[PDB]
Amino acid sequence: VNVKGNYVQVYVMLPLDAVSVNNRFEKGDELRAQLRKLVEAGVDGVMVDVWWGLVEGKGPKAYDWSAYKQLFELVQKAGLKLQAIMSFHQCGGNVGDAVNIPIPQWVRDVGTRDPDIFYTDGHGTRNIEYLTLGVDNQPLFHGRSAVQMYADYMTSFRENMKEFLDAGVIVDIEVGLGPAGEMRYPSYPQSHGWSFPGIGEFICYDKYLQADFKAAAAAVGHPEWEFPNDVGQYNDTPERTQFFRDNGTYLSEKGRFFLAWYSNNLIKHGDRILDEANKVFLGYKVQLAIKISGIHWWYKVPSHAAELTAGYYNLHDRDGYRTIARMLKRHRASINFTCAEMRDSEQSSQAMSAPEELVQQVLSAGWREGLNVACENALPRYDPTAYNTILRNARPHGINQSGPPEHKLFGFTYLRLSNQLVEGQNYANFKTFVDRMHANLPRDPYVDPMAPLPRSGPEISIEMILQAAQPKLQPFPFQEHTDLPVG
Numbered sequence: 225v226n227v228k229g230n231y232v233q234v235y236v237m238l239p240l241d242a243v244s245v246n247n248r249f250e251k252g253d254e255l256r257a258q259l260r261k262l263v264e265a266g267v268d269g270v271m272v273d274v275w276w277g278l279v280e281g282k283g284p285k286a287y288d289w290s291a292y293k294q295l296f297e298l299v300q301k302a303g304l305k306l307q308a309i310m311s312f313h314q315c316g317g318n319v320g321d322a323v324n325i326p327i328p329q330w331v332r333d334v335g336t337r338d339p340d341i342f343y344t345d346g347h348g349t350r351n352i353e354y355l356t357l358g359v360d361n362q363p364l365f366h367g368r369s370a371v372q373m374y375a376d377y378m379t380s381f382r383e384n385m386k387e388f389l390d391a392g393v394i395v396d397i398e399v400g401l402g403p404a405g406e407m408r409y410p411s412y413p414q415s416h417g418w419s420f421p422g423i424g425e426f427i428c429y430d431k432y433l434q435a436d437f438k439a440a441a442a443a444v445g446h447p448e449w450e451f452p453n454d455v456g457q458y459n460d461t462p463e464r465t466q467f468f469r470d471n472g473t474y475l476s477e478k479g480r481f482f483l484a485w486y487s488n489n490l491i492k493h494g495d496r497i498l499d500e501a502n503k504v505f506l507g508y509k510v511q512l513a514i515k516i517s518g519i520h521w522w523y524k525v526p527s528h529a530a531e532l533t534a535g536y537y538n539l540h541d542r543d544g545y546r547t548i549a550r551m552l553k554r555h556r557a558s559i560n561f562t563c564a565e566m567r568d569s570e571q572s573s574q575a576m577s578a579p580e581e582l583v584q585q586v587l588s589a590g591w592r593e594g595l596n597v598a599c600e601n602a603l604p605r606y607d608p609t610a611y612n613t614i615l616r617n618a619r620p621h622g623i624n625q626s627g628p629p630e631h632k633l634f635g636f637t638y639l640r641l642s643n644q645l646v647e648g649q650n651y652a653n654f655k656t657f658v659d660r661m662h663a664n665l666p667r668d669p670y671v672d673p674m675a676p677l678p679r680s681g682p683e684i685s686i687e688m689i690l691q692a693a694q695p696k697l698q699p700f701p702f703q704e705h706t707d708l709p710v711g
């Protein structure tokens with residue numbers, strides 16, 4: 225008997241303003257006290273946003289790493305490991321949000337003469353949270369493309385943070401690939417047009433993406449094809465529309481072509497930025513990760529409408545996550561997913577929501593492509609039931625008494641640290657959760673060592689990636705309930 229291979233690492237997200245909106249580290253004593261509570265609980269490490277708008281706020285290449293180095297030193301002196309998000313997106317910006325950190329002002333200034341640097345919807349609304357993938361390779365930003373800006377930021381990060389890498393503090397780099405750091409389109413802009421559980425919209429109207437579609441359609445002898453015009457609006461349900469209804473036009477030749485184009489572009493965006501990230505971090509003992517959004521609403525209906533508009537071309541007979549996983553394979557990149565805490569019974573009926581099945585699909589897809597898969601909780605939860613649902617997803621086949629289980633999450637990251645988490649009953653529940661994630665073992669500072677990051681393998685075409693889409697395979701079997709509950 226040796227249950228060590230069952231241990232699942234637990235990380236905790238730091239507050240969104242771990243570094244102030246002014247790019248100053250001003251809550252060090254408070255954070256130190258909170259981290260003492262995480263260490264008392266056996267936590268493996270923390271995760272933090274490394275905000276582009278804070279570090280490169282002055283001007284091109286004017287990186288100010290002062291505050292982040294102070295934070296990382298504090299985390300190192302607490303004996304915790306660190307997952308760093310390359311946060312190329314706006315923090316907050318929605319109604320009610322306390323912490324609001326835009327992308328750099330000088331980047332947004334380019335948008336005054338070129339508003340098409342932003343994802344744009346069918347009514348022309350610009351989303352200012354992230355740069356459209358359509359400008360990934362367009363040299364619009366004082367001579368640099370968006371991908372060059374991302375690569376240069378990561379290079380400066382590596383140079384400045386080399387001692388934390390070499391000391392084994394920084395162990396994961398999560399590459400932000402869209403809104404909220406997630407590889408998606410901003411199809412559900414809460415407080416800017418959408419309310420849950422609207423189907424969302426296709427956000428492909430910027431001129432760069434329109435030109436790209438035109439070129440793609442021309443290559444296949446259909447220059448006249450346009451984006452679908454029967455798709456309704458953000459807060460529709462699928463049967464309100466001809467595109468997304470049961471037996472609707474999403475099934476047609478033109479529908480399939482558009483959906484493939486839209487979702488393929490997201491895949492290509494991830495591939496090209498990961499290739500740069502891999503070049504930056506080559507030889508360091510880190511894992512590179514991407515974050516896939518958890519679009520559980522409308523999963524139960526044939527069109528999977530909200531997944532479609534987010535950019536995940538996922539249908540009963542088409543695995544829109546295994547394609548993403550296949551793209552990650554050459555990079556040895558991991559998937560960081562969400563919704564690990566959700567039960568289907570906790571969702572509203574009208575949302576046609578299946579987070580459990582979605583989680584099972586994404587985890588199975590990653591595992592079939594040989595990836596490490598990690599997860600977060602989608603929503604704040606402090607209760608045993610939530611922890612038990614996370615535990616089930618962390619070890620879907622339960623505990624192997626004598627070696628590693630057949631599948632397990634490589635890690636779990638808890639959203640998020642606050643004073644509320646680390647007092648009272650909330651703290652008691654959280655500590656017991658960490659024990660169970662660790663298979664009732666103490667913290668292992670040596671667990672899951674990373675080899676020096678090898679160079680990405682050969683670039684594969686979109687057609688090669690899409691071989692993963694079909695046939696759609698059933699998920700690996702998941703236990704209904706954890707065999708190691710909190711109690």
Ligand SMILES: *C[C@@H](O)CCO[C@H]1O[C@H](CO)[C@@H](O)[C@H](O)[C@H]1O
Binds near residue numbers: 406
């Ligand atoms: C999609 C999932 O990570 C939702 C959480 O989003 C908030 O927290 C992350 C991590 O701290 C931030 O990158 C993001 O901007 C927040 O909105």
